[PDB]
Subunit: 390 residues, 4 copies
Amino acid sequence: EPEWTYPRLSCQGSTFQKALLISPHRFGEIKGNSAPLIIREPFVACGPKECRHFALTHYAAQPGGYYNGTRKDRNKLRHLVSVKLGKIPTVENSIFHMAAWSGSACHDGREWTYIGVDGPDNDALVKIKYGEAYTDTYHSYAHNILRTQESACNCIGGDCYLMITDGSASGISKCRFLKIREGRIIKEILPTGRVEHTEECTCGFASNKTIECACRDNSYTAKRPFVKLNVETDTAEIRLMCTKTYLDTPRPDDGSIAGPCESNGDKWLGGIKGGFVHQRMASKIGRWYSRTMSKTNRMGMELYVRYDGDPWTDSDALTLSGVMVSIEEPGWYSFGFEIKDKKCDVPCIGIEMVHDGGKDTWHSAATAIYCLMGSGQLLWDTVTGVDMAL
Amino acid sequence: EPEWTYPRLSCQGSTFQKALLISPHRFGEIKGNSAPLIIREPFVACGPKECRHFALTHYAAQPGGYYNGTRKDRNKLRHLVSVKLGKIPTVENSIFHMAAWSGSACHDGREWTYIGVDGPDNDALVKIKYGEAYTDTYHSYAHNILRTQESACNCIGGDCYLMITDGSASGISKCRFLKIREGRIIKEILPTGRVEHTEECTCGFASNKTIECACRDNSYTAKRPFVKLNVETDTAEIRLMCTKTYLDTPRPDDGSIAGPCESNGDKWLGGIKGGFVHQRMASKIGRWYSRTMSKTNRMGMELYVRYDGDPWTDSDALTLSGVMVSIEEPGWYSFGFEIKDKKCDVPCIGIEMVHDGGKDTWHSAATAIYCLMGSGQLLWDTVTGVDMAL
Amino acid sequence: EPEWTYPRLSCQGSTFQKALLISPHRFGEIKGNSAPLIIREPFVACGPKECRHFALTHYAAQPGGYYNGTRKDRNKLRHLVSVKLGKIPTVENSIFHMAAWSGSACHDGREWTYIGVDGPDNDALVKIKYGEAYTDTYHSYAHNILRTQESACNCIGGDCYLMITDGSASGISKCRFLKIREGRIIKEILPTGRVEHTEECTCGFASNKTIECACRDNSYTAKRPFVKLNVETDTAEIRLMCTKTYLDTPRPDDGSIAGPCESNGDKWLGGIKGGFVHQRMASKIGRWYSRTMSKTNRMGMELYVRYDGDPWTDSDALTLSGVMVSIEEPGWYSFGFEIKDKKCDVPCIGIEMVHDGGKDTWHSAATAIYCLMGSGQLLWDTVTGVDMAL
Amino acid sequence: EPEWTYPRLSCQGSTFQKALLISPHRFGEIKGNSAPLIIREPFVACGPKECRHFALTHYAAQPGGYYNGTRKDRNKLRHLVSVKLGKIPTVENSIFHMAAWSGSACHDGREWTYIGVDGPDNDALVKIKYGEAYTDTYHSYAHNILRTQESACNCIGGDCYLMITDGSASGISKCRFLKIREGRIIKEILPTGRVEHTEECTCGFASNKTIECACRDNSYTAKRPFVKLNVETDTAEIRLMCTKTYLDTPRPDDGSIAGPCESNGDKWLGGIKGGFVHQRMASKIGRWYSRTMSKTNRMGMELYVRYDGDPWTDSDALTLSGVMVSIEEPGWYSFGFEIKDKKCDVPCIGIEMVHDGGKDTWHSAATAIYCLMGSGQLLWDTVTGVDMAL
Ligand SMILES: CCC(CC)Nc1cc(C(=O)O)ccc1N1C(=O)CCC1(CO)CO
Ligand SMILES: CCC(CC)Nc1cc(C(=O)O)ccc1N1C(=O)CCC1(CO)CO
Ligand SMILES: CCC(CC)Nc1cc(C(=O)O)ccc1N1C(=O)CCC1(CO)CO
Ligand SMILES: CCC(CC)Nc1cc(C(=O)O)ccc1N1C(=O)CCC1(CO)CO
Ligand SMILES: [Ca+2]
Ligand SMILES: [Ca+2]
Ligand SMILES: [Ca+2]
Ligand SMILES: [Ca+2]
Ligand SMILES: [Ca+2]
Ligand SMILES: [Ca+2]
Ligand SMILES: [Ca+2]
Ligand SMILES: [Ca+2]
């Protein structure tokens, strides 16, 4: 019985640096001989012995003949696949875990838990897979696209928590939390506080007692709903992030939202999933966030940090920490994950870099990686080097 | 000595849902760079640690230059191959186990048993392989295409049973059962009861004492010969399925076969292999069957269930349980298999979706998967997304 | 310390049957997307847990641009490669072990021993590799193409024996035997008896004390030099095969060589490597041989058996045992090997089927497999299904 | 806790022989179906159970559409990748470890340590990765292209040493040494003696106490700076090689540098990384070096040996030991590494054979291998067999 995974102390360090870049389409030339899968919503989750790179493929490759439709986000073809982090995710290299147009996964220290969501928009369903066996499901409660995180779920002592949501993109979307153990939902948690619209939550362990999430409100505020979840009482409350450094996109100039922490401000219809990871020290807590550069578009991506404090009531702007991607490169979904070293955990931030070339061609994405290593300051940015005409 | 496999209690659940789809030809475009094998008669078998996807390749790929002949079912080129369930079965990814134009396989908890059938139609022969070593054979007794199940054989406490048949497709085809242990036939069983024509049996454990099979009669009835095999006395009897929900194809309207359970009705020359799996509860028994939608063609596929009762003498129609495939998609051979979770077994139903485009092109198939997970009702159907012009 | 390999009793059986066929060029169409290596002199060797398929690649693939030269047998590019038996030997799937234009290998029960031969014709050299480390060599003693078996070397209790030869193809070629242990030559054996010309020896264990070989004399007789090697006294003697069923090619009509066992007869310049394997019973000894059909060309291949007796002095023709390949298909080098089952050994015969299309195109080969399984008679032959115009 | 790696006694032997050649571009024809990565600066490092082949890919393949730029040595795309020695390094077969335009790696007996260098020329940074986790960094001290060895770092009892350098290529480049343990720099060593310009050091264990390196001075002498590093006192001193057999390239005729050991002679602006490995005997020490044939260009490569003596003060020319590559083939970077046999170490010499075809096409390299095996003399040379027009 390989003991259960538990959050540890982060490894010593004080800055992020360019780590690894998976640009599969650097090999999809019409004149090349490779078959890189067409995907989106990628993310990484790590176990005690290995890190896996997950994504939602449109079940097609480049070069191929099924580019039309790769732009849509839901259909009966999309599948959750994954490869060892470091391997190019190609047709042959990939493992198709289950059909889904929305997913997540995490390793409890013994086995992998794979979460996938598919079905009709009005009654979609969450499927849970533990290793090889399909073991449970969950139904749409708001009957409007049951969806999940698009990032690693979190496990502790055997219990894994996962945020799911149901509702209109431009309306009410009260999220919920699932407490999964060995593949089956053993509890349903209903969040408290600001619950109007919450989704695509990037969660992580702030400690052995609390799991925190930075999320996405898609129709009311440029501020990010921030979840705090007590693992001991299994209760969860939500409140908007008080910092003037709005992490969502689009958004207005920093600090331009008048009023107290809780004020939503202009709707700024839409948003984006943002990265977020913890830096657990003995008596301090680093909270790293990522956010696109352009205030209105998905271009560039910068790193931000803020040690200690209550994100719920601290308006002091975040400390800029570096340019992971320039505004000349695409910066879409970002997520956080943690690599497990011999005696400590290593926080990282992934960055989906979408190759959007329009509706009349393929639509895929690279994945850029930045982790905590050493001191000083972020030294280098990331590019995809991909030309969509090849 | 990794203990022997034994049938367990099915995992809690009350409905089937779209699980996984392996559509290898979504990657065989003339403009792509993949090499998906051309196959047919696919099926899945699982061991304690992994599930493998088997099939009969025509030893050619798409795109290739050997499409002519992929339509025929027997020749000196066909081979039994397999890959980990989840991997696209391609030239590089596949393992060729042995030459055969008819096969089956199962895992006894220690090693894999591979069964293949090849040779001349008038004197074909069954080859048994245990892991790496070829260990035994069996000769044609009716000298007319010795053939096997095309689905997982079943093992218990070390002994594996397998149905084989010999005879005319439109005549007598008395099937037999082989009791294999560690690679060698240790017993031959002769069925009792209705034995005129029985084949392509989909078998599974109804319990530790009985192995049941839903089979195919190809020249007399649209009803399905149903086998019951006692593992303790090693005797087996056959009788036709009494339900008015005829599972074969072609077939007439349900309940239209006048007379008692045993009446054959019109010949309805031909048939098809059908899916069938068990749902073992503490004091109840679920029996799941699949059958094409069109009464005369291989289009669409619906799921059916029926708890308890004696299929041999119960005429009450089956309970429709969902549309796994629409009549607009192809639905050919279906089979059943079971995934092994930590403490219980998970029943599933595979569906070969053949890409028939005529005699002047390639002929291959995808494999759609549906397993028992959660409650409610089957929510979504499966498509292949493959265009045979690419 | 995983105990050393020792010859065991063959598994029960009384006939050979078509087992497996590796036709890599069924995937090398100019219109396909595969990269099967161009090779020759293939063979199989098995360990306790797996069988590997070895060959000498010309370091090129089909389709490619380096076909010119694939016809020559020696150069600075040829390499010894291998894959798990069952996997198509392609660029990606293969493992290049060492450069060589002549080779062999065997598993002592702990590690693999790889033998390769390269260098100039006048001073070639034998390289020995044990697992990952290169550990020893052997120099040309007759300074005229030091060459080896082209088939599995044989190991026992830790000591592996290997036949090597040096000399003119149409002249003297006194072979020698190397006794290798853990990668290093611990002894050199000089054969006794008829030693004029001996090579490409197919060796195997007739028992724990004797290793026997059927070989190739290339310039004097159509008869096959037969080696007997005592493992206890580490001495070896050679004498020509006395049977009237000449195994070499070319050769004259059977029994047409007048005189006693030892008479050479007409030169019949040239020859071919032939298959040969043992069937060890409790008190009997089966000796299986293969030989092409055409008396003058490499077309077709039939199986022959002969239980007990002394091949050195028995002129009774061999018992025809079946047509493994028809005279319409190519039949080149054949070899023997043994698969290791749980409690007994399973003898097999490999058949290199060369796709010779001339000097102005590629030149590669498939590998056909036949093993001992069941009773009755060899039922089916093997074809390559490959068209050299694609 | 798999014990730590320690230098052992070399395996018995007295000469080098052609071992293995990895020519990935023998498969990159425009008409082939393979995808071999475009790389440079390859090298090998071995652990107790396996040897890995590392290199710096330009994140492109042949055939591809990203050839422009493959000539430059630094950019945000270059990555450190590796495959099991014996496998062709292709898109699918390779593992991308981390982004870098300069690297090294070594196995401490438990885990792999990967070193990579990227960032801006004026402030580049060294990243250390231990297995899966990124664990430490090191900053540029001379702010001018922080670079590393391009060959296996060396570990002992758990502590790994690595040479790094910072400075102008045609000026001062005082190198430094890092003492890494379990992924983190636990010490910084400043060399003593001739420290004007030292880089691309090829290091190895001369004994349990000393690690020696043959390096590259790029702007002052054709002589090779030779490092001696005491592992017990963790101090290191440098002095130029005194032999008249200048190992650098370009260089003047041997022995033409007038003066004592320390004299630099004409600048001979430029240089090259050279191979160097040890042959540890009980009471003798073999030191093997490689150097291109042409005195001014990177063509051909010969092996040299010299037992015992102090390279710092011995002017006796080295003993020519063979032609590994002819002056008609390209001979670029050469390095040394050691394979670990059951009870002794086996020294080898790698040779990067660059396919330079100009600035208007691709630029990649094969890797030729020669190891210590047997006695006599190096018998055969190596060719790439690659035609850059295909
Ligand atoms: C409808 C809700 C919306 C977020 C506010 N979801 C969403 C947004 C984008 C995007 O803004 O680019 C891309 C994909 C999705 N997804 C879907 O449409 C199904 C679930 C998934 C997965 O693809 C992630 O939420
Ligand atoms: C001749 C008997 C008939 C079933 C009544 N078999 C059969 C039917 C079909 C089909 O109806 O599409 C496809 C393949 C076969 N098979 C053969 O011809 C050889 C054995 C195998 C395997 O391919 C399965 O029975
Ligand atoms: C010169 C001796 C001759 C056998 C009598 N060898 C030989 C014959 C053939 C053939 O007759 O088709 C093919 C290859 C070889 N080989 C060589 O030329 C080098 C060694 C090897 C390996 O290829 C096997 O002996
Ligand atoms: C600028 C210093 C110079 C050596 C004197 N480096 C160097 C030389 C060559 C070559 O002479 O062909 C190729 C690559 C490099 N490298 C770089 O430019 C970055 C580091 C690396 C790796 O590619 C190795 O030193
Ligand atoms: Ca592949
Ligand atoms: Ca928003
Ligand atoms: Ca491949
Ligand atoms: Ca019927
Ligand atoms: Ca591949
Ligand atoms: Ca002859
Ligand atoms: Ca591949
Ligand atoms: Ca120099």
